[PDB]
């Protein structure tokens, strides 16, 4: 049939009843249909209206769901440190110094009658391909993902077993996908006020509770192979056709975090954990993945909580309540990487803030059309 | 570190209910004995055997309540509520009372020796009344907080019950008050009446004749004896408690070891009266 | 559930036992033998108590001859067959029964002899003559038939060690529980009670001189007591371990077993006072 | 090679310290109180040797007036500061070695009592009244001048201990070598001479009674004597820990400390006789 | 089958051996000679049994005077040599074997004493002077040669233990087991043999006084046996678990050998015990 790119917004279906899943979107029966299609379309995973409808609805469900008190306008030794160290369940570790929530939700986007989403299903995918050999079209599309944070990418649907880096044409932009066989996951633990069995204030058999001084520090711990995903996704970097750098060489290679005084955003592990958003110093994490001999090589971060955070879509601030009290956790998989990545002498992959990028990697390949 | 652990050891929980049944056997036997031979047979002749009778009495409440807390030692409180309320009360009672006439005998003992000549009706008196409107209704009165909060607790398939404090600073200040009425004022109170006998007995080197107080002095010198380990426990125990001293979990275990042991080796003042009665000195 | 977790290294008491048994053996073989052949076969006895006293050192006399045997068992793994077994257990139980069973007599001889003072001689007579027999030794043999039946020796991981073997732990609880009885609480009740109305008719006399005989007979009474109480406490312990009450404590049941191995070693010092009571008054 | 690794956190010991400090801080308060009370102040006495009796009861006063800066320091770690250490370590030194010198003192006045018997009684009231505060009490300050500078307190782990600090160990195991020669060597042959030359001319005697004062002499040397040599042998084995000898054991070396703790604490019982051969004659 | 399993802490052993070592050195050294000042040379004698306790005194002041090389083994390691190692284990033998014969000469003298106090005079005159030389230090000089020749210092790693090394180990348990013969089986026959004849004719006697001074005696070799004792069924258990009779407790034979130093410590508390009971009676 013949087909046109066409600007109407379409409808969500999604799994989730809360309060925004239901609202705004339909109930999802998990007709999800594709038929290959031997055409060839142009798919852009940046200039996609999908994409930027993906985004704006996330960021809507995120203004809902968490409410900000006040929005605002423009006007040496290595200690590898599990979940069962001592240290661990008292949260008294050598950490940083001082300076509603919605529940796995998870919708698809349905095309409205007359209308198709073509998913461009061509391997070599770097965000984007001009001639698309392997069209599919599906009226349903899969299943996306609404977590928002920098640095990274959890509870994602489209990590594969290989990695692929998505990469935009005009700037340095990079979407990096991640490998599933290595079982990158991630945990976070915030112990609060740790109690004792029940008060027994006597005379004889007295107990006392350990009340946490510390409400500002969390630790996440972060395992998997990911040695041998760094080497996977340098080696995908080196055999990237837009690498200008030494493709025989992946010690040019480097990984990189923002300067000093650029936004928190960007140098921070900007991520929620379960209503409360944590602000990580992956210093440690970053001399335990580059293997900087003579520093502190660590497998988790000392997490700071704020209570205020930057809006990420648009310009202002968001300032919430402060934590509550109790056990705080979060528990994901970690999917996909966004950085920015620099060609040169020597190659350097710096860690950028762009949350949209995610959804934009989720969306890429869809496309809708008007029949 | 995670908390505070709380465990006795099984050598107290054997040996401890040992010593409860010695001191229970002898002390009923001879409270008993003293009893039927002095409140029944009238054979009072002297004083003191009116003050060593309410000694004997106060004894053998505690005493006939002593098994409860040696099968306490060793299994769990199924008895009820109002049972332990029983013999905490009547612990604390003996406990606070006890004190009461083993500070009376030693200001009788002064009022006789010093006071020889103008003191023969008012010895009668506090041999009639002044014990009794002056060391019961006080004992008495320290019993409310008990009778108050006192509560039994189900702690992990362990029935225990014990005087349930809202807070720490009850229980801190509690034991400082068990302190100053156990230990302090009748400590300055008995040495001060027997300082003054002594001084005045150095006085009254001319005459031997009066030689009864010997066993006065190995009461009280055996009495303080059996109970110092005990207080000087809660002492250890209350400093801990308030945050003045800090050691972590193996002090305060070591506390509740060395608490449990000294309740059995300062128990042993049940058995003071009857042995005393039975050596005449 | 765990069944057993049976513990049976027990390093220390392996020399402490038979320290005690050699001690206790040599002072029993040497002052038992010596006390009879000065009472009984010289016919040196002039008061009424030393018949019974005798008799309790010729019972004591043929427990220390069989302790080499205890001795031997408690130290190294015994060889000596199941009739020996069966012999070393019954003269054990019967020493056992006859002891309490002629402290029960020897007090109510004390009581007789104190309450009815003038008419009762004969009384006294063929109370040491006649039915002594039947009050104490063939109640002794007759509660002794289980242990002929129920003594043998087992087939171990070569151990050989031979127990008192019964078919089932309610049988052991029944059993246990009637050597409780038999052993400490009614001749218990017959002693202190006989003694305490003894003492309260002590208080009609005068400060009469018939008390300077009753010091030794009761710190006869009061050292055994004294020696058998923690013995049978330990006993009652277990016991009520039996029956799933304490059943938590599996190494605390442990701890009871080498502690009642302990005391039941401390609990055999009832030879050694016997002679040294004679050597003493 | 590890030199000390003090890191041992001894529970036991921190319990046993306080209650021994405070019983025989409370038996130093009484006893001496009323020993001083009866001979300082009524003038009561009647021989020579009761003025000995005097100065040492307050030298003992001195130690336990203070005695319990050494309980809180068991207890916890010093917050007094480090003026109170000094003055404590000072007044430590004079009683530990004035004792000493007033135990040969008086050794030597029961030696010209017995001996010379007829031509020294000016030599007996010389050494009663004049020279015996230039021979025990002033000397015993000539040998805490270094004791003066040399104590001081430290700057740990928010502990700030309170113990003498030296800049090498050739002074530290010369003044524990000079601590064993003061206690041990040359008044212990003083009084090993002086005893053998009474003992022997003791029985030159026709059954006198003048055996009976030198008992209660000999009693509180040889009680002296025996509450202290553990402490002594326990820090002369700590001497002979350095000085490049016997390095084979650090468990060994902590345990050695730990014995020097206990020791010391039994140590004190020094405080303890001086009233006690007074109470009983 | 683990051969030797051997121990290296010996922590507690090494503190506590020299503490009893120096105790029991200096009160031997201080009442031996004191007593030999007295009765040996100012010949207050009077009696026949003071004869033997004299002769019983100068073994034992020849054992005191080597126990410090005893007590620098206990805290250290040998760094005299051989000749002095060949010295102190010969007299240590002579000491051992000396003071068990001396006492069956004290119970042989008092069965002549008693039984033969008509016609024995002048064999008990010849008793006391000539023949008891021939019978016990001959006998002690012809056992020890097999310890004169035995008594080598191996040249260990860094220990140099001095102990009676042997070609194999069947001349150590029958040494052992001749060294358990010669210290009990025919002198402690001889002895209760001797002392029940004494008994036994004593009753003959209408309440005479002639067994006053006989006590002492009998507390002179209870007591001995009392601290000998533990040490000898020590040495026998080790010989029992030696010949492979008991063969699975090799942390037992350490646990033996640990007991077998402590009560050797505590057995040699029988220097102590001959002067303390002349100074009682």
Same mark, same amino acid.
């Given at each position: ?12 279906? *999604? ?35 999908? &994409? ?9 469900? @995120? ?20 979940? &069962? ?21 998870? @919708? ?19 965000? @984007? ?27 994602? &649907? ?124 992956? *210093? ?65 992959? &710096? @860690? ?9 990697? %989720? ?6 059309? %008007?029949? | ?14 040996? =401890? ?97 010093? +006071? ?24 008495? =009165? ?98 801990? =408690? ?26 042993? +003042? ?12």
């Amino acid at each position: 049939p013949a087909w046109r790119n066409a600007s109407i917004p379409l409808f969500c279906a *999604t799994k989730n009843r809360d309060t925004w899943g239901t609202i705004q979107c339909l109930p999802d029966n998990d007709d999800y249909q594709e038929i290959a299609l031997n055409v060839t379309e142009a798919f852009d995973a940046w200039n996609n209206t999908v &994409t930027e409808q993906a985004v704006e609805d996330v960021w809507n469900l @995120f203004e809902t769901s968490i409410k900000p008190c006040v929005k605002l306008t423009p006007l040496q030794n290595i200690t590898i440190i599990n979940d &069962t160290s001592p240290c661990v369940r008292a949260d008294n570790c050598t950490g940083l110094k001082e300076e509603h929530y919605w529940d796995a939700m998870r @919708f698809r986007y349905c095309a409205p009658p007359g209308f198709a989403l073509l998913r461009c299903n061509d391997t070599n995918y770097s965000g @984007f391909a001009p001639n698309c050999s392997k069209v599919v079209a599906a009226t349903c599309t899969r299943m996306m993902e609404t977590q928002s944070s920098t640095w990274f990418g959890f509870n994602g &649907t489209r990590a594969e077993n290989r990695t692929y880096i998505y990469w935009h044409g005009k700037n340095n932009r990079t979407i990096i996908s991640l490998n599933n066989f290595y079982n990158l996951t991630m945990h976070c633990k915030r112990p609060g006020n740790k109690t004792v069995l029940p008060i027994m204030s006597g005379f004889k058999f007295h107990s006392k509770p350990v009340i946490n001084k510390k409400p500002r520090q969390a630790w996440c711990w972060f395992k998997g192979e990911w040695k041998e995903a760094m080497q996977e996704v340098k080696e995908t970097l080196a055999k990237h056709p837009r690498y200008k750098g030494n493709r025989s060489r992946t010690e040019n290679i480097k990984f990189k975090a923002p300067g000093r005084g650029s936004d928190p955003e960007a140098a921070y592990m900007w991520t929620n954990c379960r209503g409360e958003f944590l602000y990580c110093n992956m *210093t440690w994490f970053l001399n335990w993945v580059d293997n900087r001999t003579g520093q502190k090589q660590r497998n988790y971060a000392p997490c700071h909580i704020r209570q205020i955070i930057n809006t990420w879509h648009r310009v202002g601030k968001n300032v919430y309540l402060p934590p509550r009290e109790g056990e705080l956790t979060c528990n994901s998989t970690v999917t996909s990487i966004i950085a920015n990545i620099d060609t040169g002498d020597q190659t350097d992959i &710096t @860690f950028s803030a762009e949350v949209a990028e995610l959804y934009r990697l %989720e969306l890429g390949d869809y496309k809708l059309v %008007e029949i | 570190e995670p908390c505070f652990r709380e465990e006795n050891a099984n050598f107290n929980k054997i040996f =401890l209910p040992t010593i409860y049944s010695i001191i229970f056997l002898t002390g009923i036997v001879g409270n008993g004995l003293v009893i039927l031979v002095m409140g029944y047979q009238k054979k009072l002749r002297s004083m003191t055997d009116k003050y060593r009778l309410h000694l004997s009495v106060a004894d053998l409440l505690f005493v006939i309540t002593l098994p409860f807390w040696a099968v306490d030692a060793v299994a769990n409180w199924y008895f009820g509520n109002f049972l332990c309320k029983a013999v905490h009360v009547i612990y604390t009672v003996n406990l606070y009372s006890s004190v009461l006439i083993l500070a009376f005998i030693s200001l009788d003992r002064y009022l006789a020796i010093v +006071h020889a000549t103008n003191s023969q009706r008012p010895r009668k008196l506090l041999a009639e009344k002044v014990v009794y409107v002056g060391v019961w209704i006080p004992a008495l =009165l320290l019993t409310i907080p008990d009778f108050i909060f006192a509560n039994v607790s189900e702690a992990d398939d362990r029935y225990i019950c014990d005087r349930f404090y809202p807070n720490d600073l009850w229980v801190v200040v509690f034991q400082f008050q068990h302190i100053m009425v156990g230990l302090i004022l009748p400590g300055i109170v008995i040495l001060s009446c027997y300082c003054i006998i002594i001084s005045k007995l150095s006085h009254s080197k001319g005459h031997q004749k009066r030689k009864a107080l010997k066993t006065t002095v190995i009461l009280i010198l055996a009495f303080f004896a059996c109970w110092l380990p005990y207080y000087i426990g809660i002492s250890i125990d209350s400093f801990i =408690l308030l945050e003045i001293i800090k050691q972590g979990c193996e002090f305060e275990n070591t506390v509740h070891k060395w608490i449990s042991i000294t309740e059995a080796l300062a128990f042993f +003042h049940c058995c003071l009266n009857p042995i005393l009665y039975a050596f005449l000195g």
